[PDB]
A paper describes a structure:
DNA gyrases are type IIA topoisomerases found in bacteria, archaea, and some eukaryotes (plants [Evans-Roberts et al., 2016] and plasmodial parasites [Dar et al., 2007]) and are capable of relaxing positive supercoils and introducing negative supercoils into DNA as well as performing other topological manipulations. Unlike eukaryotic type IIA enzymes, which are large homodimers, gyrase is an A2B2 heterotetramer formed by two GyrA and two GyrB subunits. The GyrA dimer forms two gates that facilitate DNA passage. Here we present two different oligomeric structures of Streptococcus pneumoniae GyrA-ΔCTD forming an open dimer complex with a 44 bp unbroken DNA oligonucleotide.
The C1 map displayed C2 symmetry and further sub-classification imposing C2 symmetry separated particles with either low DNA occupancy or showing 2 pieces of half-length DNA from particles with fully occupied DNA. The 30,637 particles from the class showing good DNA density were used for final refinement with C2 symmetry that went to 6.35 Å resolution. At this resolution, the DNA was easily built as the density showed major and minor grooves, and even bumps for the phosphates in the backbone. The DNA in the Dihedral complex is well defined and forms a B-DNA double helix that threads through the openings in the four dimers forming the complex. The T-segment DNA is not perfectly straight, but instead it curves as it passes through the dimers guided by the gate openings and positively charged lysines and arginines in WHD, tower and C-gate domains. The DNA interacts primarily with three regions in the protein dimer, positively charged patches formed by lysines and arginines in both the WHD and tower domains, a positively charged patch near the C-gate, and the arginines in the neighborhood of the catalytic tyrosine near the DNA-gate. The positioning of the DNA mimics a T-segment in two distinct states during the strand passage (State A and State B). In State A the DNA interacts with arginines and lysines in the WHD and C-gate domains, while in State B, DNA interacts with WHD and tower domains. Modeling of a G-segment on the open complex shows that the T-segment DNA in State A aligns with the G-segment DNA with an approximately 82° angle and the DNA in State B forms an approximately 64° angle with the G-segment DNA. In the Dihedral complex DNA is trapped in two different intermediate states in the supercoiling reaction, States B and A, or before and after passing through the DNA-gate, which are crucial steps that have not been observed before.
Author numbering:
A (entry chain B): 6 to 486
B (entry chain A): 11 to 486
C (entry chain D): 105 to 232
The structure:
Amino acid sequence: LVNVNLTKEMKASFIDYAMSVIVARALPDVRDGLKPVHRRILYGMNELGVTPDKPHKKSARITGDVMGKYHPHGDSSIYEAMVRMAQWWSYRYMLVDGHGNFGSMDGDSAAAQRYTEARMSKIALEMLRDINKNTVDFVDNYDANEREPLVLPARFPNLLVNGATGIAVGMATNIPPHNLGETIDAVKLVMDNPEVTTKDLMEVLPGPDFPTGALVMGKSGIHKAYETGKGSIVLRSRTEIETTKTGRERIVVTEFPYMVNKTKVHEHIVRLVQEKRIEGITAVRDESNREGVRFVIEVKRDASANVILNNLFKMTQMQTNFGFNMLAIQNGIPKILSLRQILDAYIEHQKEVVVRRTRFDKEKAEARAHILEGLLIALDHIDEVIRIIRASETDAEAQAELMSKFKLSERQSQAILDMRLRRLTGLERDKIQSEYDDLLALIADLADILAKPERVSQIIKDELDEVKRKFSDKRRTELMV
Amino acid sequence: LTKEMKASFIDYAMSVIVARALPDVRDGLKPVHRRILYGMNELGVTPDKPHKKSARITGDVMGKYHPHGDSSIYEAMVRMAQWWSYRYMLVDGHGNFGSMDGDSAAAQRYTEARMSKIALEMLRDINKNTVDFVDNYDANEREPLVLPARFPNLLVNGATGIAVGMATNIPPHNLGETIDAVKLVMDNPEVTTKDLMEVLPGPDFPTGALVMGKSGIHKAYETGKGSIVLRSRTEIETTKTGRERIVVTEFPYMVNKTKVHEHIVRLVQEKRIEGITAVRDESNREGVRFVIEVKRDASANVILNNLFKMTQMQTNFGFNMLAIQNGIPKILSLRQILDAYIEHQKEVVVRRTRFDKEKAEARAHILEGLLIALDHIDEVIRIIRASETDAEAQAELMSKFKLSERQSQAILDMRLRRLTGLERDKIQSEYDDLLALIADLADILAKPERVSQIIKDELDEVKRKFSDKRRTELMV
Amino acid sequence: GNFGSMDGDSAAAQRYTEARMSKIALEMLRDINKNTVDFVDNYDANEREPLVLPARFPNLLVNGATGIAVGMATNIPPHNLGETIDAVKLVMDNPEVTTKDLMEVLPGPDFPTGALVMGKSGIHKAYE
């Protein structure tokens, strides 16, 4: 069978086994927290240029395209994450704009692979634009040729606020979600104020949010989990007693906390009927739910319906003991972070992002500056260089005489030599001079941004406010003590 | 009314006859086959690349024109692959085409073909405005009504017409014999029919036969009417047991072996010579082994004359020998094919000369502007520095020297690489070369015999490239 | 598909041209093995085409014809089939019958819509 005798290669293959199973499935990353397959989806959708501006497209074709541009990995988790980042209700924020059959929230994952027709959302335009942006190393695949980026850089801790699902690999962890607006607020307060305290930002930060809209009670678990990320908290559904025209009372729920089925709990209600461990209950009904979710339990008189609500949030799954585990990974090794340290690593990432983008733009401007330096030096002593080309013979003689007379490089000399008559009007000569000084002003501006670091902070805050303007984030949940 | 009905009769009869009856004198190439070769040249894919297996070619053909069947277009393809019927050669192909056997190759697109070697030089000079064009009914692409030629294929491949008024037999001939006939009529406008007997000893076949007559050939090349003998080859050899064995290789043309053999079996089996149960007619993939053995107490020659009376081993092959030119049919003789091909090639060469003068004098005008630019430069530079517009620069150049608009703008098309003096001498050298070639073409245009010499040049080109002998062994 | 019923709207949906035939060609012609009709050859003169349509049936006598504007005009007006079979079989078993006694067998020239016919002098002229 095995007959493998060398324990050393067993240990080495076992370390690669463990770390590769880590790297494969979902991890608390530095910059996106995502699966690498998510990164694959995003980078393929970007570099194919499939915008939401353009119309819809059959997406299983795109799935096979990305699968063929990448490794021959299995289709299952691919199509799974394809659905998951198109599910509007599960992830708090919108990524993939599907068009087909999914199942709403009640245990029917419709998997119509033929009908896989979709687009994306407009938030990847805020997520990543690294076309020219020297940011991230690449790994090569098909006989080691074609790029794949290591990480997903951004200007945005959105995926902090999204939430994570990486549990069964080694030890368990997740990321519970918040909303974005007060996140922007507390972040900018740390930006302009690098020496703030936790609880004063808890004054800025409400509870961990949920897309359905949850009733939150208690803050001791909030105190523990904003610090150390461990603990379960209690969650209740928006549930009311309503009187009829007859005086009969009605238990009316609006939503539920996270990871709840209507139908499994409904079967559990029918159990509780036939289990004969709860009384009073008459009608278990649910209709018209697509204009708005409306599930109604209706109970006879002389029953103490609020005590029955107490019995619901004691024994039924309507009560939620929602636990946290945010056990981080920063450059491979597992860690654990406070809410400050997350944003700190975000800050220094934005530092490196804007610095490297500015240096790429710097080298753009420097190269074009040397171009226009050569142009203006050609404009200096024109007829002498006319005599030069009327005299000399070769590339070597021309470059030697131009370097002796004007101290320029070879490419500069040849770009001089590539000047035609139709770029010899004094109009375009002074337009060269004008755009030359324009780029000089841009170089000086970027050097001034290199002088002081806080301009980066200010521009980040500006475009955070732009995103919060285009993406107003009202609340949906409710916190109590 | 009835005059308009007569107009419809005349015009529609012209449509049908020019459609599917005899082609022009100028090409000898039927317009179906003409468009086959034109679209296969406009495939562009060389015969050097391996020849294709597709009906996409014929789909573009049917997009070019709607017939009463593209299966007939494929029939035209296959009948131009019939080397055993139509001579050398118009198809570079691979697929099933059979022989003169009764073969049915239903695999239509599954055959391979592309351009052929003779077609390559046969249809050059499209890029020289030599031949006129007409638009299709589809109003999108054009087509030529005639073709340029490098030989009278009229004589190379014959004609087997249909009787719309009457059909037409035209026999094939030989390559180099036709070349010698061209040279003969070129050197002498005073040739005779015996001269034609010299440079053409006789019409030949891709298979071979025997033509015993002489004056039928004489009336064929003079009157255009007459019938000949087509005879099978006969070889009388000795069986080891004493039988006058008959070996046959050649045959009359358009004569399958199969039904002839069946009628021979019938004539045996109708109370006649029945002891000839010896018909060894096989192994014909090396050649033709059509061997019988005459029975004992019977001579071979009587059975030979009886099968000549069966009109299949000796056949009166007639000739109608008609043609189409200037919208009319015509009874044929030589100095008509001959002078027609001569003056057609005159048209082609002279119009090619005119087009080459067009290109050469245009480029000469360019290099005029180039050398006049390279005379004096820096003053033009400094006056350009006193300007800000290419229209102003054009007006400045018109004030400076005599140029064209194209010349002025091409002088504007000068980077700093253009500012040397060696390339001045190079442009001057090619300028004098081009002036010398223009004067050469003008002197050739003031030379009638030089055209004939160019015709001799192309004849010697195709003669060094190819030749063919008389495979059809003819005794008279 | 789409045709238009009888009121001047010839629907010509060439894309929608989806069809079958009727079961009467099984009575019309079965010449597979049947040495009946010469053939003419087309694409470089190879493939068959029959000269005529033989049958066992004068059905197309009873159908009707439309050949008018070519030279002079002619048609074939239709009958029905049953009394046609009757009068034909009477001529078969009786080769020396008269016209009007078969007009006793043959009603007027028929029409598919169902027409009111008056008069028989034109019937006398046109059957002759």
